[PDB]
Design a protein around this nucleic acid. Structure first.
Ligand SMILES: [Mg+2]
Ligand SMILES: [Mg+2]
Ligand SMILES: [Mg+2]
Ligand SMILES: [Mg+2]
Ligand SMILES: [Mg+2]
Ligand SMILES: [Mg+2]
Ligand SMILES: [Mg+2]
Ligand SMILES: [Mg+2]
Length: 260
RNA sequence: CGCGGCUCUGAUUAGUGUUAAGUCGAAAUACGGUUCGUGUAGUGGAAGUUGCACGGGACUUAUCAAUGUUGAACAAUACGA
């Protein structure tokens, strides 16, 4: 069965300094990751996914419509742990290599800050904001910001559930609305018939998530309160998060090829 | 003296044993060229042969017109003689 694993630096015991109280991280990871794994176990208790890993269940249950409920619990457990696994007990100084690509791609580290934080609030819904690394066979490494919805995964092997654009406020009769609507059916029709829209490289090496931001309410509603009056809330939660990012590890997983 | 038993003999007559170098057929052993044998009743130079029922110690010697299957798609980081 799938069991809960400890956190990075005993966050469950002490928690982050000025980002999450030990009681909040307890309700956010222990009392929730355990709840998700209990449901995940019941769904794979007697199937081939019984001994498979979370990410393996994600890629294997991405397109199958009869396993969408299994994808949620598997993808949620993977995304949730991916969030806490990149937090540092003490602020870290951004490396030189990473500090270069961020400025070359987004213009400035402060610009990337507002883009991710701005996307978290602009999304108005529980999800995850990713910092993806895209590198086509001919093009160089390029960093962008991808925002997934409730349990969507950023990996290319699970593009079937790359839930990054709501349909209730993005598909309409307006000029931009019709464009989104066309792309909607173009994906559903292409995916259904098996055709691929964007050619990808083998092994899903195109997109490599490096950083994540969990915007679900169970992670900040208790600590930063609702947010009425401009104090705390989902806004301050995203701001304080930006200070505890493990830029040392973020740069590592990025694997920015040295060319300077 | 009679009857019975026993022994020997008897014109004439039957059977069987032995005997490589004769004669006439070819009945059996192979589907032995009419399946062979048992019983019973006939028949023919001889072995044979005929009827009727019976036995296998003769047919288990037996070896597909059911003609033999798209038994749940494809693609993925799954899969890799
Ligand atoms: Mg005499
Ligand atoms: Mg005869
Ligand atoms: Mg004869
Ligand atoms: Mg005969
Ligand atoms: Mg006879
Ligand atoms: Mg006659
Ligand atoms: Mg015979
Ligand atoms: Mg015989």
């Amino acid at each position: 069965q799938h069991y809960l694993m400890p956190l990075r630096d005993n966050f469950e015991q002490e928690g982050i300094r000025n980002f999450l109280s030990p009681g909040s991280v307890n309700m956010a990871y222990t009392e929730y990751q355990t709840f998700i794994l209990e449901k995940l176990n019941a769904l794979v208790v007697g199937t081939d996914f019984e001994q498979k890993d979370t990410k393996s269940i994600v890629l294997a249950t991405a397109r199958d419509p009869e396993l969408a409920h299994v994808f949620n619990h598997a993808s949620m457990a993977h995304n949730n742990h991916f969030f806490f696994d990149h937090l540092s007990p003490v602020p870290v100084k951004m490396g030189d290599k990473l500090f270069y690509h961020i400025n070359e791609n987004f213009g400035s580290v402060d610009t990337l800050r507002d883009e991710m934080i701005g996307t978290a609030v602009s999304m108005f819904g529980p999800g995850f904001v990713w910092l993806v690394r895209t590198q086509l066979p001919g093009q160089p490494v390029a960093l962008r910001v991808m925002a997934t919805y409730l349990a969507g995964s950023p990996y290319p092997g699970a593009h079937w559930r790359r839930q990054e654009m709501d349909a209730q406020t993005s598909i309409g009769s307006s000029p931009q609305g019709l464009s989104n609507g066309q792309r909607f059916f173009e994906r559903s029709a292409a995916g259904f018939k098996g055709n691929k829209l964007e050619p990808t490289a083998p092994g899903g090496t195109d997109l490599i998530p490096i950083l994540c931001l969990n915007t679900w309410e169970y992670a900040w509603l208790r600590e930063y309160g609702t947010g009425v009056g401009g104090m705390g809330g989902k806004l301050a939660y995203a701001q304080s998060w930006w200070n505890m990012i493990d830029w040392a590890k973020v740069e590592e997983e990025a694997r920015l090829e040295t060319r300077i």
